[PDB]
Amino acid sequence: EDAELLVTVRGGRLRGIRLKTPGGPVSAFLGIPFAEPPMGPRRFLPPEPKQPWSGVVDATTFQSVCYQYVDTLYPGFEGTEMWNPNRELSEDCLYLNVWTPYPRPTSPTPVLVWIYGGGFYSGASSLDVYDGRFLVQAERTVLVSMNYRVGAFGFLALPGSREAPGNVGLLDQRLALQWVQENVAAFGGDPTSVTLFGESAGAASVGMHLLSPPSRGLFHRAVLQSGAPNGPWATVGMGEARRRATQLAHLVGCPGNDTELVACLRTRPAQVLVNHEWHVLPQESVFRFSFVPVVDGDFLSDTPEALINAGDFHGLQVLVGVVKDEGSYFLVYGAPGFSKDNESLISRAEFLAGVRVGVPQVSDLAAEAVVLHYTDWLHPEDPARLREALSDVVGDHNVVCPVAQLAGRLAAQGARVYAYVFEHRASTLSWPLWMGVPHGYEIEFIFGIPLDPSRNYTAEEKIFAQRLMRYWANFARTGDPNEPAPQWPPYTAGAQQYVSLDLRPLEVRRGLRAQACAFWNRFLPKLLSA
Amino acid sequence: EDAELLVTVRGGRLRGIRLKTPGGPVSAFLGIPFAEPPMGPRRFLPPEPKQPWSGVVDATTFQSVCYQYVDTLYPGFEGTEMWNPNRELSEDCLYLNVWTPYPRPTSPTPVLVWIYGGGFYSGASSLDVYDGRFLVQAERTVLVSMNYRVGAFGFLALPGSREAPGNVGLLDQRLALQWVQENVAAFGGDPTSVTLFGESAGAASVGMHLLSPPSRGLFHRAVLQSGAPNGPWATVGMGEARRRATQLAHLVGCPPGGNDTELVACLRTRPAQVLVNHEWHVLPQESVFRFSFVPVVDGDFLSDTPEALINAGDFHGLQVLVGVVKDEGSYFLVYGAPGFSKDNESLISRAEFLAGVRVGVPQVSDLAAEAVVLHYTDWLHPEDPARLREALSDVVGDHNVVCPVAQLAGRLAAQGARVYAYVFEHRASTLSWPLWMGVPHGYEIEFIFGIPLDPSRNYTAEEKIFAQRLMRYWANFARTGDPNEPAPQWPPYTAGAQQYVSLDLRPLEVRRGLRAQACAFWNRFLPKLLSA
Ligand SMILES: *[C@@H]1O[C@H](CO[C@@H]2O[C@@H](C)[C@@H](O)[C@@H](O)[C@@H]2O)[C@@H](O[C@@H]2O[C@H](CO)[C@@H](O)[C@H](O)[C@H]2NC(C)=O)[C@H](O)[C@H]1NC(C)=O
Ligand SMILES: *[C@@H]1O[C@H](CO[C@@H]2O[C@@H](C)[C@@H](O)[C@@H](O)[C@@H]2O)[C@@H](O[C@@H]2O[C@H](CO)[C@@H](O)[C@H](O)[C@H]2NC(C)=O)[C@H](O)[C@H]1NC(C)=O
Ligand SMILES: *[C@@H]1O[C@H](CO[C@@H]2O[C@@H](C)[C@@H](O)[C@@H](O)[C@@H]2O)[C@@H](O[C@@H]2O[C@H](CO)[C@@H](O)[C@H](O)[C@H]2NC(C)=O)[C@H](O)[C@H]1NC(C)=O
Ligand SMILES: NC(=O)c1cc[n+](COC[n+]2ccccc2/C=N/O)cc1
Ligand SMILES: NC(=O)c1cc[n+](COC[n+]2ccccc2/C=N/O)cc1
Ligand SMILES: *[C@@H]1O[C@H](CO)[C@@H](O)[C@H](O)[C@H]1NC(C)=O
Ligand SMILES: *[C@@H]1O[C@H](CO)[C@@H](O)[C@H](O)[C@H]1NC(C)=O
Ligand SMILES: *[P@](=O)(/N=C(\C)N(CC)CC)OCC
Ligand SMILES: CCO[P@@H](=O)/N=C(\C)N(CC)CC
């Protein structure tokens, strides 16, 4: 056997696999159990640390995906199948993965921990797009990713209960972070240089660990890609969380005691809760999710907006960014007149219809302030302009402006922030041309998927991916993506400087849609209060 | 005696003068009485028609300026004194002027009737810049202008009362319009072709005559320059009018509210200047672009608000010419907005801009002010003083002039009226206001009346050709309802294309949208914030 693939963690012995990379081998330890399987009476409960095992646990392949809905809108279409589970579904799913150089490092090595996205209802660490073998080989870091419970299994909350306290999917992430602190040194990783990074709902989780003191001491830097904890979709109140948990019970035949309600829920097969989790949303919507983190005073002592405005973020370096067309992807999932199979040139009626879907559960006055700001009153009915306006509505409201608010507040309160806009449309992109650079399609370049020989990325895209991996690893090692060439300046509340990321050199620009985000971040909150 | 200077109207015989212009002689009849003097017991009452007279009335000079406030912020400064009264102040002031070609026309000639502006508190038809001699000589028109009561004398309203019904200054104008229908043919004018045109409050007055049926039958075409009846300043509610009238009476010592008859009768014993000295103490807030006594929406002269009448109106068979200047709001900022002055560049701070917004947009909720800050702030340069100065100028201009004018033009075109729109973009070479004000409110007038043709003033030769271009524009509209001749063409304004033309020394240039993005906010969104 091989000594490099044998590691002993505090729980027992593991056997890993040697992986092939176009630049040499890497060692991967996949499917490491970090928690007791949260099945049966442990459904909805906080994770328990994995009990010690005797013998060798086989860490040779990815474990099962946590139970989740599977998207069926475009069956077989690459653009949506790449996000779908590529492993068997199971509630026995609390495993993590470690990628390290081969041979393992002698000196402590910076550690990158990845939290996947998926609207808190889906996602898996085993997706081909999250393959950490290229990043580890190219940049000589230790890569860790974990599975956490999603949907009702991870975020069903009966606030004040103890059988369903909520946020346990976030506690899965924290437990894995505690696992890293206790065991990453056995792989050559440095537990004193842990950099969290995630995308979409994973970026929102990254932000929530920043604002929760128990998790704050488990990492040192953070990267938030196209997501933020202050997003209108990322958290839910205690009252609404209880309403949604109660109606899911009614939708599946349960039962009144919180104790009895969760007891009856625990008898239902996991696939049953998945089939009814979406029917508890209050209205027809794009970009809203049933079971999300809950603000209950525990994991989050206040709303993410409150904790951001009140925090002291000196000594923290963060890397945040968005893609160019954040809203395009979500429109084909309910916005009237939208489909990937044509140009979705909508009418004024569909535009106004789509505004109520992209900005749900707001007053009529609030809805038409949106229509006022996103209408070009010299071309109020131009179909092409309306298509891009509605995508701007969805993208600004849900991603770009929550991220811009977080960058501005953190920068003004001690943190050193670096901001980017990802503007490269991959040559392999199967989505229609009118979507531009859709949400989530910067990930494959960050993980260096273009260097896979199996794929048809071009030579310039391969160099671009190596640039991006160098930016991300530089930040993980020092909190500065620059190398001591065009320089990436920190984002500040005043200058609001950010960089373009594409095949061209770095271009410095001002304003993460400052005009549009002044409406979302400054004016409309005052409109809803009065 | 000269037969061409003698005219007989229904009230008696008149004697005018032969005016010399650069182009030739004009016959002017200045100071024709059209109403009984609204003095003593007639103060605050609708005008009575002037009773017939024996002998010849010498209509040979401008009569008195109706009692009003006299501006004093920049004493002796030409830019402000041009608007101040150039005759003695009097309550005996209901006179109109008529200019006509020399010799009198042989056939009926179209008539242009002028209504001056001045925030319903000032103004006079005798001002040098309303000299109708150049228009008549250059375009062979009959031009009529009248005086009307302003301030409390013209628009103090105790709604429902018979002794102070309000809107009597408007009835002064309507009475003059009835005078034109009965007497303009004696001067060679065509009563079947009467074009009303005014500016600022006079433009708001022109609009209110379109929306009042008793007035609508007295003319056929309208021109509104930098004003509209639907502006937030042009009318007031019956309840606020009563409060403003009561508190003015209280400030001058009447009664020593209660009975309306007793209240007004006490007010009628107060000297005219005393009422003027307290007129501005009744305003609810410190503001620019708000005036104490203006038309009232009482259900009589205006059955409903001008916005309601504009929306529910059928305007087929009506031709309207509308427009504004390039920088409508800059003039008003030197009259209260913190940090502003004509004597420096008025580069204001962020706090001065925020403070200036509530002065320019008075009595709106704090939520409403925030919306204004949001739309007029450039969030990449939120504290640039030069940008902040222009933004406050646009705030006051759009809210008070441009946006209301644009709402009127759009609703009229959509509802059957032929509309033409302009933006006056020429800054006169003789302008005494500082440059940062650009083309200020009310400085297109001197070109419309052809003042550059006056040999005693130093306009350039290009500005004299420009004035002759605009005079033909206005006269072509008055004659035909179309400013075109039949040369670059001036297309009609429509709710969709929103086409207008620029009026400068260069030829015509078609553009789209009268600050559409900005005005959408004033005309579409903000009304419903105020509702909820
Ligand atoms: C572009 O397509 C959308 C989506 O319609 C679906 O996809 C098409 C490719 C075709 O297969 C249709 O039969 C599918 O229904 C059209 O959007 C409309 O969408 C609403 C609800 O989202 C639906 O009720 C309408 O029937 C759709 N309109 C149709 C089918 O004409 C959109 O109209 C297409 N754009 C065009 C034709 O310009
Ligand atoms: C409001 O007052 C008018 C007028 O009052 C007159 O003059 C006052 C100074 C008082 O002292 C009395 O001399 C008068 O009454 C009232 O209208 C008058 O009504 C009376 C008889 O009804 C008549 O002799 C007067 O000529 C009227 N004067 C007018 C019409 O101008 C009116 O009734 C009073 N209103 C109320 C509610 O009492
Ligand atoms: C620009 O001028 C304004 C107006 O001030 C008046 O006009 C000036 C030309 C000068 O003659 C001043 O003395 C006049 O009072 C200035 O705003 C005023 O500033 C002074 C103090 O400098 C203050 O006492 C007044 O209250 C201010 N008035 C208002 C209406 O705000 C402004 O500061 C000048 N800009 C500069 C100096 O940069
Ligand atoms: N459990 C479910 O029924 C269920 C249904 C739908 N979704 C997610 O919806 C599909 N979707 C997937 C990706 C992006 C958007 C959307 C929908 N937008 O309205 C999750 C669970
Ligand atoms: N009766 C008065 O005291 C009085 C005072 C001031 N004004 C006019 O004030 C100057 N002014 C001049 C031009 C434009 C606006 C303004 C005022 N806006 O509040 C009229 C009457
Ligand atoms: C690369 O292109 C070939 C063209 O024949 C195609 O068959 C193959 O699937 C492509 N590889 C991808 C899409 O990864
Ligand atoms: C025109 O300019 C001349 C040149 O000094 C001057 O005498 C005259 O008064 C000016 N006319 C005006 C200011 O109206
Ligand atoms: P407008 O009636 N007119 C003004 C200010 N003016 C012309 C006489 C002076 C330039 O006032 C705002 C309604
Ligand atoms: C906040 C909702 O968006 P995120 O959870 N991420 C998504 C939807 N994807 C799919 C493209 C990347 C994993």
Curated annotation (Swiss-Prot), chain A:
Tissue: Isoform H is highly expressed in erythrocytes.
Known EC number: 3.1.1.7
Residues bearing carbohydrate: 257, 342, 456
Annotated active site: 200 (acyl-ester intermediate), 326 (charge relay system), 439 (charge relay system)
Cystines in this chain: 66-93, 254-264, 401-517
Subunit structure: Interacts with PRIMA1. The interaction with PRIMA1 is required to anchor it to the basal lamina of cells and organize into tetramers. Isoform H generates GPI-anchored dimers; disulfide linked. Isoform T generates multiple structures, ranging from monomers and dimers to collagen-tailed and hydrophobic-tailed forms, in which catalytic tetramers are associated with anchoring proteins that attach them to the basal lamina or to cell membranes.
Chief location category: other
Enzyme class (EC, first level): hydrolase
Catalytic function, reaction form: acetylcholine + H2O = choline + acetate + H(+)
Gene Ontology terms: biological process: acetylcholine catabolic process; acetylcholine catabolic process in synaptic cleft; acetylcholine receptor signaling pathway; amyloid precursor protein metabolic process; cell adhesion; negative regulation of synaptic transmission, cholinergic; nervous system development; osteoblast development
Effect of residue 439 to A: Loss of activity
Family to which this protein belongs: Belongs to the type-B carboxylesterase/lipase family.
Swiss-Prot/TrEMBL keywords: Blood group antigen, Cell membrane, Disulfide bond, Glycoprotein, GPI-anchor, Hydrolase, Lipoprotein, Membrane, Neurotransmitter degradation, Nucleus, Secreted, Serine esterase, Signal, Synapse
Matches recorded under PANTHER family: ACETYLCHOLINESTERASE
Binding sites annotated in the UniProt record for huprine W: 119, 200, 431, 439
Protein topology in the membrane: Peripheral membrane protein
GO cellular component, one term: extracellular space
Record's function text: Hydrolyzes rapidly the acetylcholine neurotransmitter released into the synaptic cleft allowing to terminate the signal transduction at the neuromuscular junction. Role in neuronal apoptosis.
UniProt cross-references to PROSITE patterns, sorted A to Z: CARBOXYLESTERASE_B_1, CARBOXYLESTERASE_B_2
Compartments (UniProt record): Synapse; Secreted; Cell membrane
Protein name (record): Acetylcholinesterase
An example Gene Ontology molecular-function term: hydrolase activity
Keyword Membrane: yes
